[PDB]
Amino acid sequence: SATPHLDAVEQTLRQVSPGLEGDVWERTSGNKLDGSAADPSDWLLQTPGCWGDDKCADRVGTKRLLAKMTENIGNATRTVDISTLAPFPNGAFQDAIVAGLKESAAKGNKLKVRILVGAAPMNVIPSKYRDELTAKLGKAAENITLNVASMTTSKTAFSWNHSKILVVDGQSALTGGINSWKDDYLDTTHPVSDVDLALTGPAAGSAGRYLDTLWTWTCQNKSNIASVWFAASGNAGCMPTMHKDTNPKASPATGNVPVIAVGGLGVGIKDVDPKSTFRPDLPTASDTKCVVGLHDNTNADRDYDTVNPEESALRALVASAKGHIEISQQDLNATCPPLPRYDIRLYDALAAKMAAGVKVRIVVSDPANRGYSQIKSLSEISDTLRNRLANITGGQQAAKTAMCSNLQLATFRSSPNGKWADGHPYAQHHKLVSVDSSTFYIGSKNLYPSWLQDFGYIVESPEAAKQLDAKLLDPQWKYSQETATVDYARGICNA
């Protein structure tokens, strides 16, 4: 095949979540990574994009991210569809949305707009955000039908929307890890380092079907104050199926890029995919669950996987690698309680790969951040990998040799300095996996245990994967390798 990695992932997802194909995951062809003529890798909406400068003076990433947001929204003719994690967008993110909506209005378009945030359980937040937006729009609000909502799907599982998506006309989609939070990303001399992608094509429709899934639940639960706080313009109702109702089911082709869209429904929306007959083997005994009483959805709940295909898709992406795997995350491990510390099957898949000589790079955020870190030491990652490798290499000594011959494990820096020039540690927030300079995931879904609604794209294009290397992964490794505890390429093995 032209696409051996997507082929593998697709076969898994069809076993795991068949009833969800089309809506919560979907393979499409004919997409385009939507970069400029001048700088074609700029589909890759990294932020801040100030490599090598501990002052972050020239934020070429941030500038491109905001311009692209405004451009896509300003090209809207029918719909704008936005999800994120609360707080609601502010500062220049908000400015970007308003500028775009004013542009669309000035071109003569009447739009439907949904803006959905996951929260944390008398909430005036949504009505307040609607009113602020309508005010800032002025006249341009007259032809916008607006829906604004905050939602929590499960209080006990800490489940709510964590996806960050911006779909226009079901044709263009921006998604990734970036929260629209000005103080963390923008008005700061220690900006969080993160990444979204920009695409067009049928895969933008997959995002639109994903958001209709979320809004169908939200609108159903709109009179439940515990679950949903909803606010709309004028007389307008909740729009559960804006995408279905307004955009073509058959989104126009824009390129030749194959993509798998994959999301998750968390906990509290739908408990199982009744069509699934997936029954995987439970992994070998681990020490992931810190307390006996905790219900562990990541490692001990078969029904959970079936409505959360993204967990399996990321494990399947790892399992598809023939040569090398690069992972860039905030964390690999979660704080326990109330989550288990780690995804056992993920670490098992990384271990299987290193046992077979496939190289693995893991960069996480500096533990000095601990919001943007959930470990105290990199040894919490290496110990776990070593322990899972021991199960398959015959013991602890062999495990450590395998690990040291195949792992790069470090914390993130973006310049020669150990911290930003302002004294604050570098924080990263990517949810990035790339394999074989071929196929990569950019989305909201963390690899650490998490039971939220999330979404992302897995893209198979060596062209694009090489741009990703040159523009993000190579510079990341250039500066971050100085913190490595394990680095096979340099004979470093301190774990």
Catalytic residue among 190, 243, 429, 430: 429
Cβ atoms 360, 350 nearer than 8 A? yes
Where do the H-state alpha helices sit in 240-330?
242-246, 302-306, 309-319
Q: What gap in Å lies between CA 73 and CA 102, rounded to an integer?
A: 9
Based on the residue annotation, tell me whether 295 is a catalytic residue of this protein: no
Token pair recorded at residue 420:
């930003």
Cβ atoms 426, 414 nearer than 8 A? yes
Q: What gap in Å lies between CA 474 and CA 467, rounded to an integer?
A: 10
Based on the residue annotation, tell me whether 454 is a catalytic residue of this protein: yes
Where do the H-state alpha helices sit in 121-240?
125-137, 182-185, 202-220
Transcribe 129-156 into DSSP letters: HHHHHHHHHGGGGTTEEEEEEEEEEETT
Residues 6+ apart with CB under 8 A from 252: 171, 201
Based on the residue annotation, tell me whether 194 is a catalytic residue of this protein: yes
Cis peptide before 248 (omega within 30 of 0): no
Residues 6+ apart with CB under 8 A from 161: 83, 84, 85, 116, 117, 118, 151, 214, 452, 453
Catalytic residue among 81, 196, 273, 454: 454
Q: Dihedral sign, CA of 303, 304, 308, 310?
A: negative
Beta strand pairing status for 257-263 and 359-364?
unpaired
**Angle, alpha carbons 430-263-365 (nearest 5°):** 15
Q: Show me where the chain is broken: residue before each gap, C-N > 2.5 A.
A: 121, 370
Based on the residue annotation, tell me whether 162 is a catalytic residue of this protein: yes
Catalytic residue among 34, 42, 54, 162: 162
Catalytic residue among 194, 196, 212, 331: 194
Q: What gap in Å lies between CA 230 and CA 239, rounded to an integer?
A: 11
Burial pattern 312-339, b for ≥16 Cβ within 10 A else e, equals bbbbbbbbbbeebbbbbbbbbbbebeeb
**Which sequence positions are flagged as catalytic?**
162, 194, 429, 454
